[PDB]
Subunit: 254 residues, 2 copies
Amino acid sequence: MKLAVAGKGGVGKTTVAAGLIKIMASDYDKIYAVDGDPDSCLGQTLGLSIEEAYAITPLIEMKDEIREKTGDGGLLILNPKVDGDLDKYGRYIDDKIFLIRMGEIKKGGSQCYCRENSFLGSVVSALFLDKKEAVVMDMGAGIEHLTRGTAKAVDMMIAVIEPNLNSIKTGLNIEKLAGDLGIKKVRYVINKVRNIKEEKLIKKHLPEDKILGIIPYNELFIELSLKGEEIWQSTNPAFVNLHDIYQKLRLEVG
Amino acid sequence: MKLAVAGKGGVGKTTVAAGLIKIMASDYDKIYAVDGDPDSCLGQTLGLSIEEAYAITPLIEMKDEIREKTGDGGLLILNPKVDGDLDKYGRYIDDKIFLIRMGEIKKGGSQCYCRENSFLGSVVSALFLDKKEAVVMDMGAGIEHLTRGTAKAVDMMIAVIEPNLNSIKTGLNIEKLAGDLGIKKVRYVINKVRNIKEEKLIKKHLPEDKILGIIPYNELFIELSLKGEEIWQSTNPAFVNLHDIYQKLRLEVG
Ligand SMILES: [Zn+2]
Ligand SMILES: [Zn+2]
């Protein structure tokens, strides 16, 4: 399956993504985990040290490959065929999970970054449309890496939000952008829930059938989110709850 | 960890074992799954066809190896060193799970089977005491393959029973034999629960802290237990419940 996980906050949302990826390794022989959020470290939540994650060259820094896929001076290519060279664009964390880091885009400094952006786009296209393997791509609230073309291949867009007015609004906007792009299913995972009043707030603004699951706030999560990996470990209190969320996802996608 | 799963019934108990093994593959790089119950097919519940499971030569039929480990005519050896040749005594089901089948012992036909029994015993000893890898051994209510020596290496003995007087008695006897052998922890998994009255019966005869988990009887389990694998699949209704049982086990063992 092809999954997209989006939201603000950063680590919180990335924590859910890493959790699903790890659980997914039991059902798939290979998973492409794509870090498309420069503000959080997907590799870290997947068990690597922040250092090991950053030692993986990001897509944006593969100049030799970018030259080879878009042309060398003058020679322009708007549709780079990179689906065959994917394994050179990241590192296997283990026998099943292959991590790719997009890297951050240069917002806009009067310089030309067309070749770079074309290269990133071609990799995202390859992963979602050409590769058969499972893909989980972690991204920001703007989901700017998805296009109408790749959106048709997405099995589900998961918006991760916190139980408050502003975060709920963010999620509804994610849902708006995804629908506009043509994504078939959008579902929510509510994170950092502290009290029941907050759960009632969620139920008031969001359809319950659209809620994949609820993850309670963890005190051992604010003072321990960089040692014993994450919520996918069998010792973590969210372990079982996370598998329920995964089962609902699997059933939803078919 | 080193686990032993015992009970009557056969498939029911073997179903729990296979479930734990599959879930365990996420936490361990290699697991020795040992079918020590000739009445049920552990490999089948682990995803193989009954045919593929039976094409794996059982310990009892490795005459060449048995000769090489106990002597050849006259030459007797009561303590065969077979911990180094384990990978020749089974088949890898996949990249992590290695299946070994004990085969059935000749109850007693006036023939000498000392060499055979010594060989089986040496393999069980090697797995529990010498190998570092995780081991899950499925066995009958008599747990006759365990000895006081190997019992010291067992992290937990799991007795699987049904909610009725006779099955409860069976489990208490399993607990008796295990304690006598010196096994440190015995825990229960109650299977095929049909109603709440039965749950009350369990609570009446067994300490609740000793109960790892309860598995409801499945109607799609009586008419579907040889097609879509088992309870470890993400589409199975017992999926989440099984992970809760696994977490309690992990926490118990430490
Ligand atoms: Zn340009
Ligand atoms: Zn003899």
